[PDB]
Each structure stands twice: as C-alpha cells, then as structure tokens.
Design a protein around this ligand. Structure first.
Ligand SMILES: *[C@@H]1O[C@H](CO)[C@@H](O[C@@H]2O[C@H](CO)[C@@H](O[C@@H]3O[C@H](CO)[C@@H](O)[C@H](O[C@H]4O[C@H](CO)[C@@H](O)[C@H](O)[C@@H]4O)[C@@H]3O)[C@H](O)[C@H]2NC(C)=O)[C@H](O)[C@H]1NC(C)=O
Ligand SMILES: *[C@@H]1O[C@H](CO)[C@@H](O[C@@H]2O[C@H](CO)[C@@H](O[C@@H]3O[C@H](CO)[C@@H](O)[C@H](O[C@H]4O[C@H](CO)[C@@H](O)[C@H](O)[C@@H]4O)[C@@H]3O)[C@H](O)[C@H]2NC(C)=O)[C@H](O)[C@H]1NC(C)=O
Ligand SMILES: *[C@@H]1O[C@H](CO)[C@@H](O[C@@H]2O[C@H](CO)[C@@H](O)[C@H](O)[C@H]2NC(C)=O)[C@H](O)[C@H]1NC(C)=O
Ligand SMILES: *[C@@H]1O[C@H](CO)[C@@H](O[C@@H]2O[C@H](CO)[C@@H](O)[C@H](O)[C@H]2NC(C)=O)[C@H](O)[C@H]1NC(C)=O
Ligand SMILES: *[C@@H]1O[C@H](CO)[C@@H](O[C@@H]2O[C@H](CO)[C@@H](O)[C@H](O)[C@H]2NC(C)=O)[C@H](O)[C@H]1NC(C)=O
Ligand SMILES: *[C@@H]1O[C@H](CO)[C@@H](O[C@@H]2O[C@H](CO)[C@@H](O)[C@H](O)[C@H]2NC(C)=O)[C@H](O)[C@H]1NC(C)=O
Ligand SMILES: *[C@@H]1O[C@H](CO)[C@@H](O[C@@H]2O[C@H](CO)[C@@H](O)[C@H](O)[C@H]2NC(C)=O)[C@H](O)[C@H]1NC(C)=O
Ligand SMILES: *[C@@H]1O[C@H](CO)[C@@H](O[C@@H]2O[C@H](CO)[C@@H](O)[C@H](O)[C@H]2NC(C)=O)[C@H](O)[C@H]1NC(C)=O
Ligand code: 2H9
Ligand code: 2H9
Ligand code: NAG
Ligand code: NAG
Ligand code: NAG
Ligand code: NAG
Ligand code: NAG
Ligand code: NAG
Ligand code: CA
Ligand code: CA
Ligand code: CL
Ligand code: CL
Ligand code: ZN
Ligand code: ZN
Ligand code: ZN
Ligand code: ZN
Lengths: 686, 686
C-alpha cells in the first residue's frame, strides 16, 4: 500500500550522501552563475522525480560582494602611517581545494565602504548587556572608537546594531577559540574545529522581516519601484569585517586601558582581554585602520518551486522549503538540508509514479539568497501572500540537517507538538546504545523537557531562517528539525563535504533520520484527514508565557501599584482559550460530513493565523505574530509575548515612567485581546 | 415551497409602516437610555421572529454632547462687547412635538470648546478647490479668521479639515436654500423643504476608518487601553457649529471685502455672498463670536447581533446591517432602513419556523453610534476581524430606504452587478407609468448607465456609512440600495414619521421595493449554491479605472517623459486579470463535487479580499482596499486607484517634482502588483 511507511522506507541514506556530494563541489553563492546552474539542475531533477510542475521564480534584490580588485583588510598602523600588521586576504584553502575558483573571501555582507582609523574597544559579544556594562558600570565611551567583538551568543546583525547605537565608527568580528574550538578535537582537516586562519562569513543586516532592503511589502519583480539606498531597510551605517583568531590575537594582544570586568569577558587566547580604549603605553600612538570596499548591487536570484497537486484538497498547501545558496561550499549549511529535501521529493515522486497523490497539495522550495537576509523566501511569500494567507496549512523548514551528532532538535509551533511526539515514537533511533528503540525514546532521554517528565524538549521558533515570513509575518503553522550537539566551521571555506562525511555523519544515518522526521511531518500534514494540530497544546504554553511575562513585571511592584498595571485580562483570555480549545477538541473527536470536517480543518488551519495583528509590533511591521517574535536583542532567539516583553525591557531606565508603564498596559491589552480573538475562532461558528 | 419568491411575498408594506412609526416616536440618540431601550426591544423582537441567537454587543466609545446648562450659540458682537444678534438655541419643534423631551439641540459632534471672536470669511462649500480659489487666485488669507461655509457637495468633516489647514480659528456651517430648498415645494410641515429655522446636525470627525477615536485597531471593550484625548484620532482642532438660513442671512448680510469670484459661489439668499474678510464699512468694528461648550465623553453603545445559522455552510456569513441611532427622530435616517431590516428578519423567520434554513449563515445587525463616526459597526468588526476575514461572504448595508421617490439607487462592488441586474429583472416596478414592468426596466429608463445602452447606473461605494469597515478595511464584498431623487430635512428635528408618510412614500411601496432588493440580495448570497459574484465584471471596471487614472497622468506629458512614468505594468495586470477571470468563469460554469464547488466558492469569496494591502494607503492605515477608498476630499465619494489618484492630485504645485513623480510610480507598482495578485487567486490552485 501507499501509506506513510511506504514513503519512509523509500528514503535512502546513500542517496542523501550522493546528493550532498553533488551539491558541494563548487561554491553556490547567491546571485552567481554557479547558483543559477544549480537551480536549473534541481528544477530538471524535480521534474524527472515526478512533480506536476517545477518552475523558477526570480527576483532582482540587493546583494553585497567584495571588490575582486580592491580587497578588504584591517591594519595596525603606526604614527607615521605605516601599516605594520595586516589581516589575511583569504582563508588558506583546505586539502585538494587550493585550486578551486570563486571562493568569496571573508567579508560581512552589506557593510558600507570606508577606511576608518582609530582606537579599539573590546566589547565581549557586543550584546545589549555587554554595552550596558561598558557604558553604565565601566563608564567606557564607544563613541568614535572601533569596536572588536567576538562572535557567538546572538545574531551578528544585532551586534552591529548595538555597536552603531553605542557610537562606534567600525566593528571587527572575530571567532574566539572559547566559542569555536571544542577541547580535545583537532582543527580541520584533522577534526571539526576552526583553525586560526578560519573565518565566519555572514550578513549584518537588521531587516526585522522586511526581505529585500529596497522593496519592503512587495515582490522585487521586473516593474518594482525601489527605495533609494539611503531609505533601504536594515543596512549598517559603519564598516564591519570578520577575522580569525590568529589575526584577532594580533589586534587584542596590545590592548590597554581597563581590565575585563569579570571572567565572562575572557575568551581562550593568551591575551588580557583588556577593554581599552586603545593600546598599552609603548603602543599608545598606534591605531587600527579598516579598509572596506565591498559594493551593494541589485542582482537576480532564483527560487525553485515544485508542486505535487493534492487529490482531494488541492487548494490547501503544505510547504517544505529550504535554501540552496551558500557562503562557500555549504557542506552543512544548507546542502545537508537540500540533499534531504531532494531525497524527500524523490520518494514522494516514486509514490506518485505508482498512482498515489497526497490529499493536500505539497509545495517544495529551493530558496535563493537566504544568506543575504532570507531574501528568496520572503520575496516569493510577498508575491504570493494572498494565496498563502488563505490556503497555507503549514511550512516545514529544511536548512542544515546536522549541527552535531548527539540528538534531535525540534523548534515549532505548539500546534505541531503532538504530531512530532507521535511521529518520533514510530521512527527508529539512529543513536549508539539505542538500537531497537524509538527516536522519541533516545531524544527524550538525551534532551528532556524542562517542565515535563518523560517528554522531550521542543523549543519555540526564533528566526534567522526561511520560515520567518511564513510564521511571524503570515501566521502559517511552522516547524523545523535537525540533529544537534549536547558549530565551529560555520560559514568558513572548511565547511565541506569531507567535514560531514568524515566527522559528522559517515553513514548518513543522522541525515536519514532527519529526512524521516521532516518528510514524515510533511506526509501527515498533507495526508491526514483531520489536520494533525492540537489546539490544547497552544493553551498550555500560553499559560506558561503569561506566567513568565507577569513574573518579569512583578520585579517592579511599586510601579505596578502606581500605574494600576494588571495582567488580569491576559490570564482571563488564556483561561478562555483553554476552555474553548477543550470544547473544540471534544467536537473534533466526536463529529461522514466533509463540510463539518473542512469547516473544522479551516478552524485548525486559521488558528495560527488568528495570532497575527495586521498593525504589526511596534516599529517592526513585518513581525505581526503577537505570541512569538524574534528577540529584539538576538534574531536567532524567539521571544514570547514580545510586545509586552519589549515594553518591560530595561523599563527602570526610562525617563518618563508614566509613559513607559502606559505602553506596558497597552501591550497587555493587545495580547489579551489577540488571545481571546484566537480562542473565539475555535468557538461554534454560528 | 421555500424559495426566494416565498421570502419576497411574505414582506409587507403595512408592516414596514408599523415598524417605522414604532421607531420614530421619541429620539434615539447614541449613548442615551432611549436608544438602549430600543436595542432591547429589537433584541426581543428578533428572538420572537425566530432567529437562533440574538445578543447585544456593547463598547465604551468617545461620544460628544452639548452641555444642557451652558448652550452653544453664535453672536455678532459690537466694539463694546455687546452681543447684538444671537443664533437660535433650538429648532422650533414641529406640530405635535412641541412637548417632546430630549431633542438634542443643533451642534457639531466632537467640536472642541471655545469662544473664538473674529472676522468672517465666506468659503463657499469649503471644498479643496474653494480654498485653492481663495488662497491662490484671490489672495485671501483665512488664518485667524472665522470661516462660514455652506453645507453640501462634500462630507462636513472634510470641510472642517480644509478650514483647519487654511488656518481658520472656527467654522460656522449653514444650510443654504440653494442646496436645501427645492423650487415649488413648501417648507415642513406643509412640504418636504427645510424651513429657515431648520438645522443639520452631524459629526465633523476625520477618522479615515479608525472607529472609536480612542482605540484604533482594537475593540473598545472593558479592558481596552485608551489613547489620551490629545492623541485621539480624527478630532477637530477648532470650534464648529451649524445654523439655519434665517440665522445665516444675519451673519452674511453685512459681509464686505471681495466680491464672490463667480456665480458658483452664490447661493439663494438676498445677500451679496461677499467673501470678506469682515463686514462693510459701517459695521467694520463688529465681529463674530462663537460659544461652544460641548463635551466629549466615553459612553456605552449597544449593537444588536442576530444569527440565523446556515444548514450547509454555517461558517460562511452573509451580513445585513444598518444603524439604529439617530440625531433626533430618524424618520428617514436610519429608521426607514431599520424598519425594512425588521420586516426582512420577520420574513426570514417565518420561513425558519416552517423548517427552512438558508444554506449559509445570515447575520443581522442593528448598529449603534453610526452618527458619531461608524463607531458600533467598526468596533464590532475590530473585535471579530478574524472571523470576518476568513468567513465573510458579503455585507449588505441598510440605512435610509428612501431619499426621494424617483428611482432606485445602487452602489456596490462590481462582484454584485450581475446579481443586482438579475434580481431587479424579477421584481415589480413600484413607479407610476411602469405598472406591470420590472424594476430593472423602470430603473434603467430613469437612471441609464453612462457607458452601456440598456443598462442602469450602479455607482462605486464611497463611505460615510457602516459598510466602510467591511469593504475598505476588511475587503468583504459589499453593497447598498435605496430609493432616490432624480434631502432637505436631513438630520433636522423635522425628519419625522409624518415627513415620510405624507410626502415621501404614503403607501410604503418604495420601502417594500427596497426591502425586496436588500432582502433578495441577502437571500441569493446566502442560498445560491455557487456564490452569485461575477469576476468578469471586476475586469471591465478595472480597465475603466486604469484608463481614467492614465488620463489624469497624461495631463503632464513632460513630467511623464522626464521621470519615465509608465502605466504599462498596470494595463498588463488588468489584461491578465481579464484573461484569468474569463478562464475561471469557464471552469465555474463547467465543473457533483462539493470540494471543487467550495474551493471555487472560496476563490469567489476571497477575490474582494485580494484587493486588500495589509500596509494600507499612505497615512490612512484603515483604508486597505487598493481599488477603492473614500475620496481624501470628500468621505461620501468613492475614488478609484486612490493611491495613484492622491499621488497625482495637485502635483504641479509640489516643490520637489522628482519625489512627487517617484511616489506616483510607486503607487502604479503597488496597484499593478495588487491587480495581478488578485488575478492569480482565480488561477487553478495547483
Ligand atoms: C473570558 O470569557 C468570559 C465569558 O465567560 C468573558 O466574560 C465577559 O466579561 C465581561 C467584562 O468583564 C463582562 O462585561 C460585563 O457585561 C455586563 C453586561 O452583560 C455589563 O453590565 C458590565 O459592565 C458593568 O460593570 C463594569 C465592571 O465593574 C463597569 O466597568 C461598567 O461600567 C458596568 O457597570 C460588563 O461590561 C461580560 O458580561 C462577560 N461575558 C459573559 C459572562 O458572557 C471575558 O471577557 C473573557 N475574557 C476576555 C479577556 O475577553
Ligand atoms: C501578465 O502575465 C504575463 C504572463 O502571460 C506576465 O509575463 C511575464 O512578464 C515578465 C516581465 O516582463 C517576464 O519576465 C522575463 O522573464 C524572463 C525569464 O522567463 C527573463 O529573462 C526576463 O528578464 C530579461 O529581460 C528584462 C526586460 O528587458 C531585463 O530587465 C532583464 O535584465 C533580463 O535581461 C524577464 O524577467 C516573464 O517571463 C513573463 N512570464 C510569462 C510570459 O510567463 C506579466 O508579468 C503579467 N503582468 C503583471 C503586471 O504581472
Ligand atoms: C550533479 O548531478 C547532476 C545530475 O546528474 C549532473 O548533471 C548532469 O551531468 C551530465 C554529465 O555532464 C549531463 O549529461 C546531464 O545533462 C546533467 N544533468 C542535469 C544538469 O540535470 C552534474 O554533473 C553533477 N555535478 C557534480 C559536480 O557532480
Ligand atoms: C600591509 O598592506 C599594505 C597595502 O598593500 C602595505 O603597504 C603598502 O606597501 C607598498 C609597497 O611597499 C607601498 O607602495 C604602498 O604605498 C603601501 N600602502 C599603504 C596603504 O600603506 C604594507 O606594507 C603591508 N604591511 C605588512 C606588514 O605586510
Ligand atoms: C497522537 O496520538 C494520540 C494517541 O493515539 C492521538 O490521541 C488519540 O486520538 C484518538 C482519535 O481522535 C482518540 O480516540 C484517543 O482518545 C486519543 N488518545 C489520547 C489523547 O490519549 C492524537 O490525536 C495524536 N495526535 C495527532 C494526530 O496530532
Ligand atoms: C414599539 O413596539 C413595541 C413592541 O410591540 C412596544 O413594546 C411593547 O409594549 C407593550 C405595552 O407597553 C409591552 O407589554 C411589551 O412588553 C413591549 N414589548 C417589547 C418591548 O418587546 C412599544 O410600546 C412600541 N413603542 C411605541 C412608541 O409605540
Ligand atoms: C444674546 O445672548 C447673550 C447671553 O445671554 C445676551 O447677553 C447677556 O445679557 C444679560 C442680561 O441683559 C447680561 O446680564 C449678560 O452679562 C450678557 N452676557 C453676555 C455674554 O453678553 C444678549 O443680550 C443677547 N443678545 C440679543 C440681541 O438677544
Ligand atoms: C444572471 O443571469 C444570467 C442569465 O440567466 C446568468 O447567466 C447564465 O448562467 C447560466 C448558468 O451558469 C449559463 O448556463 C448561461 O450561459 C448564462 N447566460 C448568460 C451569461 O447569458 C448569470 O449567471 C446570472 N448571474 C448571477 C447568478 O450572478
Ligand atoms: O539573515 C538572516 O536572518 C539569517 C541568515 C543566515 N541563516 P543561516 O546561517 O542559514 O542559519 C542560521 C542557523 N543558526 C542556528 O542554527 C543557530 C543560531 C544560534 C545558536 C545555535 C544555532 C540556522 O538556523 O540553521 C545567518 O544566520 O547568517
Ligand atoms: O461619520 C461618518 O462617516 C458618517 C456619519 C453619517 N452617516 P449618515 O448621515 O447616516 O448617512 C450619510 C448618507 N449620505 C448620503 O446618502 C449622501 C451623501 C452625499 C450626497 C448624496 C447622498 C447615507 O449614506 O445614507 C453622516 O454622514 O453624518
Ligand atoms: C573595484 O576596485 C577597482 C580597483 O581599484 C575600481 O577600479 C572599481 O571601480 C571597483 N569596483 C566597484 C566599486 O564595483
Ligand atoms: C562620548 O564621546 C563624545 C565626545 O567625543 C561625546 O559627544 C558623547 O556625548 C560621549 N558620551 C558620553 C556618555 O560621555
Ligand atoms: C560524533 O559523536 C562522537 C561520540 O559521542 C563524538 O566523539 C564526536 O565528537 C561527534 N562528532 C561531532 C562532529 O560532533
Ligand atoms: C456644563 O455647564 C455648567 C453650567 O455652567 C457647568 O457647571 C458644568 O461643569 C458643565 N458640564 C460639563 C462641562 O460637563
Ligand atoms: C496669513 O496670516 C498670518 C499673519 O497673521 C501669517 O502668519 C500667514 O503666513 C499668512 N499666510 C499668507 C499665505 O499670507
Ligand atoms: C414624489 O413624487 C412626485 C411625482 O414626481 C413629486 O411631485 C414629489 O416631489 C415626490 N416627493 C418627494 C419627497 O420627492
Ligand atoms: Ca520585497
Ligand atoms: Ca476601536
Ligand atoms: Cl532548519
Ligand atoms: Cl444604505
Ligand atoms: Zn542556512
Ligand atoms: Zn548560513
Ligand atoms: Zn444613517
Ligand atoms: Zn445620518
């Protein structure tokens, strides 16, 4: 028969391996010819595999590249203007790739041009709290200084936003061995650690969901009206560049001024980690000079969109999407995920060739320019927003399949928790010591839930990947899964096929397990008669998030008294959601009537949709989900009740407490209303 | 059988008459006890009539009332400060009502308080072009002057906005016999004309769709966070008051300064209609002084919401709504419409008692506080926006059933044109000389289409009534119909039951015809297996609107050359919409499969929805429909392609033509994209 087991059994580790090798022999940088050719290859293969239609959707978006004849670098310059030390012009290429063309040298995408010269200040991870510590506690002024920050902890775009607001005139990002060199493992090529010459590429935008910087709200098609550069969304105002730890050592070793405030500011290099500003006595007249000559350029990008039409509900879409563009070879990010998507399409197509079709339409996407700000997925979702609004059942992301080899990682809407628990109980664990056990068993043992005995940890969605437009802008139930650790070579030339094959997943069994999870989720979402969402799981978390935000507010009891700040309405809404969801579940379990079913399937599908506020969150119009947004301090992390959270954040420092607490009360009202409105979508319809 | 004819035949003119009498014996001002009692009466009766559920939905919104012990009036004041002439404190009540309590005296709702004293400037209708003529051509400066404007031509809130932007310190509105006294007809009580002591009440807000001034975006429920008054939406900054033409004569007769520029500035009073500023030589030291003491007050309002649950698609809503609050007796506005709604509910309920139910759910609404800015309908739609978004088939308004006795007036989305043509061909004409003919025949003869021989005129929707939130904010297909002229007593104490019974519709046959049209539209929308919308009619008008906006732009050929302004993308989108709609129509006609049907019904229902832009129009976030918005110069009138229209308006006067024409190009792109996106909702779904 054609059931989920047939689909799952058709997936093969050796196919995922062959596809990964095929996708990682040359760089596939967004906007390059190589990446367009790979798009055409994937289009051809998805057609071969049996999809009903496979098209390219192209857009012309703002990208950023170094100038090939005017390289980016950083110097220490003496008082005479002699550059006495220069950072590297490229990463030493790995064995057998020393003759590979078109490896983009390390750079921070979308940096403006400039040659700022000045004194260094070391800012730890450049987090909001690191700048609070510098200004407020240490009285160190970053204004007109060049800041040097270690990568880690938060999205690099937030570091740059923080540095710019502190008054910095430039930012140097570096990888500290504390964060990118695991003890007892060798550097690439002899292990999976970052060598001293390795460097992390990546964009430094603050788009807040906008997509292409020049066309927020609308797809960057052939007749698009573009903003001028000065009005573009999210671009940094100061030059930025990344370096490795051999080069960082040379910039940090001379640092003087103030000592690091505590051990959490010290990395692993043999330097004092002095904050500065500037260098110790003998070197006080030396400065650091950046030379950044990259250019932003409107460039064509190509998504591949594959359709497998539903037999019964072709106007309901379950979407499996992940990106295809890479910084260099993309051995993990994204090709470990793209290879898994490729094998999932192959398996679905095998069933289709035998006469099967899923109940609902499945869309498969190979997104372009994810690395430059989620551009491909976001432009396509802007172009198709009305179709997605009214027809989108779910989005399953499919970027990197592995970031470790220890256990499963799942981040998803509460609506998918039950689906994920049930599916993983039917899959085999690939882990050593768990042979013959379920993936649910191994995952729950290795990654226990912090609140529930005998359950595994599932995280909320943050951002920094292609589900952002679907989840936080459009309110379509979204999820992701991969294998994880209890990674060093991220965005470096060393992230190759060999890295994966030798050190992460030699048998491709973790890749196969991830294909089973992502593919099984898609299968159930596209084929189950009743959509596999449990609204009651949203009720449970909403109470947890309400308790959490109330607890933050209760750090300020006097102000809550003074300004009459009550969470009563939010708890009332959550209580109402809990009751209504319980009754809806009874009806769903207790209802031959396809209209009641589809009416009920529409209530399930539109439930995530009901958490959207069309006015957006404050100053972030494309983050419209009221329960979840990317943290304003770290795009990778999710924040719950973000509008109330941001209203409360650092509120003791606000000069007008009446106004600040009034805005907290406004956000409580918006959240209580949105939770009650979403509950009411589950009430009897008439 | 139970079919449309059974529903139509059950409607009775004598019932509409009895209900109108019942609703108009005392005032029903929004926020008063009288209007709450009438709400409870309607709730009880709709239950009696057979509705499944009938509830009150209440909100606490900003209303405005005169101060009962400190009356509003206007004076001419001499140099010593003696008030030598005072405007009336109330309208002389009509025969038999001279002892009726609680008649609100004439005032402009939401006027701020003040006692401004100054020189008059007469500004004709206070339209945008009237102020252009004053400032630009006549060099008359309104700054610090009191402006006197005649009612007519545009919504009174636009007049006040225009006066405020001209620098006026107050506005006097008056009814000129030119506009409110039809030749050869007697003043009330002996005819339907406005007497010299009659005065038009009405609000002077500029809400642009916001609803309650204090809670834009969210319902004004018990825990709502309110804006402070200074941040409220739409309130006027200068005092305003309305007067009748006996009082206007006394203010205008002394006017000096400049002569009226031409005859279009002259009304019918025996005065020169001099523009001013100020009075002629002998009276130059006299001034005009306003005394306004009204107060804005958060007040509870009550909508009645009646549900008749659908038998097959209970999660699809067809809404018949109209308001219940009146300025005084509401003999025409709104009770002539409310009485018709009441009889429609009675007739549907008669069928329901016999075992019938409509295919889809019908919701019936008696809205409160329409006269204070569409507040009741808009707060309820804000509270229920997700349900309405995803389930709203159509909204049929039901305010005044008559404004004349000549022929039918219909304003509606193009999606309802075919429905209206077909329905009116099956209804009897009530007109003298057309006995035995169809309403379609009489209407088409009396009100021919300007573009099509043998068709009647149907207008686009403007605003100034309760369909605004449903149509321009939420994108639900909307329509309205009433009897019209080829009205003088509007919002005056003289607008009574006797006015209607004696002068407008003694037999109640025009009311019955309107009940047949509104009720028949609701019946077909709620019962037809395929929704009665023809997408091809949208294609035809979109081409007409594109031709229109291109023609406006082509008044500036040099600028279009200089800034490369092309409408090619918009015409391409319209061409695509035309083709795709034609193919969709073929499929609809050519498709036993209830999923294909409902998939197709969803494509029909979401087609109006697809013209919504979630970012709204510039500076008007609640006007989200890209094809239709209320004119920025006159809330009552609809404007097509409003974003392009406003970008082009008076563009020759803009100081930075590059920026202005760039914004025209941006709006062309938004419109072309939205039309193409709406077309694509009608494509095959997969
Ligand atoms: C969760 O669901 C419950 C329903 O089970 C829902 O309860 C509703 O609460 C509101 C607000 O508390 C109630 O509102 C009251 O309605 C009555 C008329 O029915 C009014 O008379 C009340 O107003 C008086 O009292 C107020 C409070 O002291 C005064 O401010 C006011 O001036 C009046 O004197 C009041 O508006 C409503 O009746 C219930 N609905 C029910 C029980 O069906 C609750 O709102 C939901 N939670 C959320 C967050 O939506
Ligand atoms: C109305 O529907 C039609 C479909 O019938 C749709 O036609 C589309 O028009 C676009 C834009 O004109 C076409 O875009 C082209 O696509 C090809 C690849 O297929 C590209 O190579 C083209 O780019 C080249 O040429 C450009 C113009 O000179 C250059 O600016 C560019 O740099 C490249 O050299 C171009 O992007 C598209 O192929 C068709 N789609 C079809 C025919 O299926 C039209 O867009 C719809 N109208 C609206 C308003 O949407
Ligand atoms: C990746 O695999 C693809 C698909 O097999 C290879 O592309 C094919 O290459 C052969 C030999 O050059 C051609 O005859 C086919 O037309 C190609 N098919 C396509 C593009 O669909 C490609 O060579 C492989 N790439 C690498 C680096 O191994
Ligand atoms: C670091 O790089 C710079 C730039 O290439 C070197 O400085 C240049 O040296 C050349 C040849 O000696 C001169 O003609 C240029 O005028 C110099 N340019 C600048 C901007 O100074 C520099 O020598 C390098 N430093 C080290 C230590 O290798
Ligand atoms: C996950 O699996 C559980 C266990 O089978 C499902 O819960 C059962 O669902 C059936 C059918 O509705 C009910 O009859 C049982 O009473 C349920 N058992 C329980 C709650 O213990 C559950 O629906 C599945 N989740 C999905 C499909 O999302
Ligand atoms: C309007 O009609 C209503 C409905 O018939 C009248 O209200 C009823 O009045 C009688 C006699 O006072 C009561 O016994 C009923 O309880 C009322 N029914 C309701 C409110 O549903 C009302 O009197 C009429 N108003 C006027 C001005 O004629
Ligand atoms: C217009 O109305 C005003 C206010 O009632 C009248 O002026 C008042 O007259 C009384 C009694 O003569 C005085 O005690 C008040 O001081 C006056 N108030 C003001 C504000 O002037 C006025 O007489 C009326 N004018 C006409 C022509 O009837
Ligand atoms: C209005 O009435 C016309 C005339 O009956 C309807 O058009 C017919 O619809 C039927 C059924 O789909 C077709 O078989 C005919 O070919 C149509 N005749 C035409 C176009 O002349 C039309 O659908 C009705 N409009 C509605 C229901 O909105
Ligand atoms: O521009 C954006 O929003 C993100 C672009 C780009 N996304 P990516 O490198 O493909 O993926 C981020 C990557 N990050 C993580 O998984 C992660 C992030 C923080 C901590 C632990 C793991 C992922 O989600 O797979 C980036 O982070 O540079
Ligand atoms: O605040 C608002 O938007 C409108 C409130 C209020 N609406 P209304 O008096 O009930 O109805 C306006 C009324 N106006 C017209 O029909 C009309 C308006 C201009 C020209 C000819 C007819 C109608 O739509 O029935 C008003 O116009 O004062
Ligand atoms: C890159 O640098 C070269 C060499 O100095 C210069 O001529 C060219 O303009 C630059 N290219 C850009 C800015 O795209
Ligand atoms: C930091 O430095 C500059 C002076 O160059 C000054 O303008 C700015 O206000 C300083 N900030 C603080 C907090 O001292
Ligand atoms: C794979 O798992 C083994 C065993 O726990 C571990 O020693 C190794 O470090 C893992 N590899 C990676 C890349 O995490
Ligand atoms: C109305 O006017 C009276 C009498 O002058 C005054 O005492 C009262 O405050 C006013 N009421 C208001 C402003 O609501
Ligand atoms: C109108 O009058 C005031 C002077 O009282 C002045 O400030 C304003 O600029 C004037 N406007 C014009 C156009 O003359
Ligand atoms: C009713 O119609 C007649 C005949 O045309 C006309 O004389 C009269 O003025 C109409 N009444 C109103 C209120 O328009
Ligand atoms: Ca865009
Ligand atoms: Ca509101
Ligand atoms: Cl992922
Ligand atoms: Cl109406
Ligand atoms: Zn990635
Ligand atoms: Zn990446
Ligand atoms: Zn009205
Ligand atoms: Zn009115």
């Amino acid at each position: 028969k054609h059931n989920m087991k047939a689909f799952l059994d058709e997936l093969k580790a050796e196919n995922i391996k062959k596809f990964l090798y095929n996708f990682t022999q040359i760089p596939h940088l967004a906007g390059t010819e190589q990446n367009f050719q790979l798009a055409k290859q994937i289009q051809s293969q998805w057609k071969e595999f049996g999809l009903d239609s496979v098209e390219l959707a192209h857009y012309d978006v703002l990208l950023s590249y170094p100038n090939k004849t005017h390289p980016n670098y950083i110097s220490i310059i003496n008082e005479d203007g002699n550059e006495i030390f220069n950072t590297s012009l490229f990463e030493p290429p790995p064995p057998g790739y020393e003759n590979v063309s078109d490896i983009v040298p390390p750079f921070s995408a979308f940096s403006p041009q400039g040659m700022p010269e000045g004194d260094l200040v070391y800012v730890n991870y450049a987090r909001t709290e690191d700048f609070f510590k510098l200004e407020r506690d240490m009285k160190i002024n970053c204004s007109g200084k060049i800041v040097i920050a270690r990568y880690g902890k938060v999205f690099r775009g937030n570091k740059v936003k923080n540095a710019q607001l502190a008054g910095a005139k430039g930012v140097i990002l570096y990888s500290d061995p504390a964060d990118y060199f695991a003890p007892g493992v060798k550097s690439y090529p002899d292990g999976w650690n970052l060598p001293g010459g390795g460097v992390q590429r990546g964009n430094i935008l603050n788009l807040n969901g906008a997509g292409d910087p020049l066309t927020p709200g609308y797809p960057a098609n052939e007749y698009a009206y573009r903003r001028g550069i000065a009005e573009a969304v999210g671009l940094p105002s100061i030059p930025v560049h990344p370096i490795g730890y051999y080069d960082a050592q040379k910039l940090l070793e001379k640092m003087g001024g103030s000592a690091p405030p505590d051990s959490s500011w010290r990395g692993s290099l043999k330097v004092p980690y002095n904050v500065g500003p500037g260098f110790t006595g003998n070197f006080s007249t030396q400065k650091v000079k950046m030379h950044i000559h990259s250019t932003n350029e409107v460039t064509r990008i190509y998504n591949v969109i594959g359709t497998l039409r539903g037999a019964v509900e072709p106007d309901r879409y379950v979407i499996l999407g992940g990106h295809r563009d890479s910084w260099v070879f993309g051995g993990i990010d994204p090709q470990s995920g793209a290879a898994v998507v490729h094998e999932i399409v192959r398996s679905f197509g095998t069933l289709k060739k035998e006469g099967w079709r899923p109940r609902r339409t499945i869309l498969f996407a190979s997104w372009d320019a994810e690395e430059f700000g989620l551009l491909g997925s976001t432009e396509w979702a802007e172009e198709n927003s009305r179709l997605l609004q009214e027809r989108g059942v779910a989005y399953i992301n499919a970027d990197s399949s592995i970031e470790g080899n220890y256990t499963l990682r799942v981040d998803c809407t509460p609506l998918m928790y039950s689906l994920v628990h049930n599916l993983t109980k039917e899959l085999k664990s690939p882990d050593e010591g768990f042979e013959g056990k379920s993936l649910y068993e191994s995952w729950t043992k290795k990654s226990p839930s912090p609140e529930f005995s005998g359950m595994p940890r599932i995280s909320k969605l943050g951002s920094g990947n292609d589900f952002e437009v679907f989840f936080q802008r459009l309110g379509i139930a979204s999820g992701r899964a991969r294998y994880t650790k209890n990674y060093p070579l991220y965005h470096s030339v060393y992230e190759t096929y060999e890295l994966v094959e030798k050190f992460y997943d030699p048998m491709f069994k973790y890749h196969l397990t991830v294909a089973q999870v992502r593919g099984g989720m898609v299968f159930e979402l596209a084929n189950s008669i009743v959509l596999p969402f449990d609204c009651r799981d949203y009720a449970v978390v909403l109470r947890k998030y309400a308790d959490k935000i109330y607890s933050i507010s209760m750090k300020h009891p006097q102000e809550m008294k003074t300004y009459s700040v009550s969470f009563d309405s939010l708890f009332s809404a959550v209580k109402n959601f809990t009751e209504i969801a319980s009754k809806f579940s009874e009806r769903l379990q207790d209802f031959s009537n396809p209209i009641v079913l589809r009416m009920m399937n529409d209530q399930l599908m539109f439930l995530e949709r009901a958490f959207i506020d069309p006015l957006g969150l404050p100053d972030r119009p494309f983050y419209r989900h009221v329960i979840y947004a990317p943290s304003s301090h770290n795009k990778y992390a999710g924040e719950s009740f973000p509008g109330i959270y941001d209203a409360l954040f650092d509120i003791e420092s606000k000069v007008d407490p009446s106004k600040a607490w009034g805005e907290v009360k406004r956000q409580i009202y918006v959240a209580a209303f949105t939770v009650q409105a979403a509950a009411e979508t589950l009430s009897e319809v008439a």
